[PDB]
Ligand binder design. Sequence first.
Ligand SMILES: CSC[C@H]1O[C@@H](n2cnc3c(N)ncnc32)[C@H](O)[C@@H]1O
Ligand SMILES: CSC[C@H]1O[C@@H](n2cnc3c(N)ncnc32)[C@H](O)[C@@H]1O
Lengths: 286, 286
Amino acid sequence: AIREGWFRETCSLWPGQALSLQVEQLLHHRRSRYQDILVFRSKTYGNVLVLDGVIQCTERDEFSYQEMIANLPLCSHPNPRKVLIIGGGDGGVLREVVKHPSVESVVQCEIDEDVIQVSKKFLPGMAIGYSSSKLTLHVGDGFEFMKQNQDAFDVIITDSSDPMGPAESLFKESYYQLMKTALKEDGVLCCQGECQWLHLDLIKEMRQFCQSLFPVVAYAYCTIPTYPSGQIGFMLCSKNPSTNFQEPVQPLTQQQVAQMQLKYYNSDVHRAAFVLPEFARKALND
Amino acid sequence: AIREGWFRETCSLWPGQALSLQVEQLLHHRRSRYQDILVFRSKTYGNVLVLDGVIQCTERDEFSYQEMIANLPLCSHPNPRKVLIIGGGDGGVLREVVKHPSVESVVQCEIDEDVIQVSKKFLPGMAIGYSSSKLTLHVGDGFEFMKQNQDAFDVIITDSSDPMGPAESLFKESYYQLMKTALKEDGVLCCQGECQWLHLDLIKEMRQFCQSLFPVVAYAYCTIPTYPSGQIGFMLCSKNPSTNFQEPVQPLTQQQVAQMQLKYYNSDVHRAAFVLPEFARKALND
Ligand SMILES: CSC[C@H]1O[C@@H](n2cnc3c(N)ncnc32)[C@H](O)[C@@H]1O
Ligand SMILES: CSC[C@H]1O[C@@H](n2cnc3c(N)ncnc32)[C@H](O)[C@@H]1O
């Protein structure tokens, strides 16, 4: 687990490579009903949450992912008022969504209440979202939860743990049809979407699938040192055929960026996040 | 060190974090006059070159670095004819440079001819650069070599090993003044420029330093899984006060990108590479 002061992350989904983070102190290590939960204070990345041996987040760099997954869809919708977050037990996405004054209601469906309690203790800067008055906190499997909803949400965001745990249910491609049903007529979604350096083939397959459900599908990415290969992508889908994901319909002003305390996201970054290395552009377009 | 089938990279310049690569086969491990040279066949990244314990390149991902470092300055010059590469023992940057019909000669000054011999054996897709009729290969410390030149080059690229071992001489800020003198009146340069997630303070210092030497200075970055934190930046300097580094003065058509066999670089990627996360935009501009 932790050997000789280092925690090393290995996974069949990124074979032959591994990030290690040096450990100052072990903070928490218990199995919930659903998963193995491990938290440590790392030497240089602040606190680090691990679910079934895969890094969920670190306090040092969590802001890239949290801001981009929230603001990519939110700033691609002209007036999002009702938002659904699936997963996000650390509170971080919620933290970012509630910053938008157009957002009145955020329903969060998280399967594992233990994650929520440990994030409250050990990820205080992420879990600050739990004190928003916009929050409706829900419990359960997000896949089956999605079935409950029709024509209900302006924006849905899925921030999942790994396909080996409780998050497997969310990997049934039918979840995207459930999400489409749950969305209002002109709704948008953003899902965690594969690393283009690691599973370009799955992105191409997922894009093609999404394309036959939605008039507008796009792939974007951001960098984050502590994700495998140092970055991750997002699938964006709109039921609105006029959605242009690459040009934000709500461009943030610098004053807005400042007020929101954003450390990664802005309008230019929104645009560039869609510009892919040639190999990936070719794969997904040609 | 390889231990239990893994190579693990640590460096005080990225404290508390490590990349490990799984080793299929040790291939070469010898000290030259200048440095320790380690080559292995990795399980999932092809052949890997390590100098004094720091990864220089992997066959699987080397292309992002090689292509960006060459095309960022070359596509920002209206007619680059005379090129200087400092370092580049693996032949990778050379490979990318000679693709340009405008280039008539490339001088490459490499300190360590054993890196050249190991790369020609173990990095054959990179060492294909050495085949070029445009090459004038030179031996020595690129620092002292820089002093020999005045008003000689359109473009200078410095692709060095790390600020331990023989690349120390190139980390003297004076080297930038030497490159300015070595450049033609409208010459441009590209140097490896620091990871914005690791040493943003250093980029700020370096940009201020370069701005007092050159009328136009820019910072861009590319992603590369096997660099610390998954990415690296580039300092771009022009002696031409009309240079706009962010908009390529030489745009490439799709046909050209196809012809050049590019896997990462293209013109949209060029422009996007100058779009920094908010925290680094703030630090470098505000
Ligand atoms: C920490 S962010 C990722 C979160 O997604 C949660 N999660 C995983 N699977 C599901 C699911 N099927 N439904 C709702 N939330 C989930 C995990 O418990 C974790 O908190
Ligand atoms: C493998 S690419 C990086 C290269 O830079 C070379 N290099 C390091 N220091 C110097 C120097 N002072 N002058 C020229 N080349 C150098 C290294 O030997 C290596 O081949």
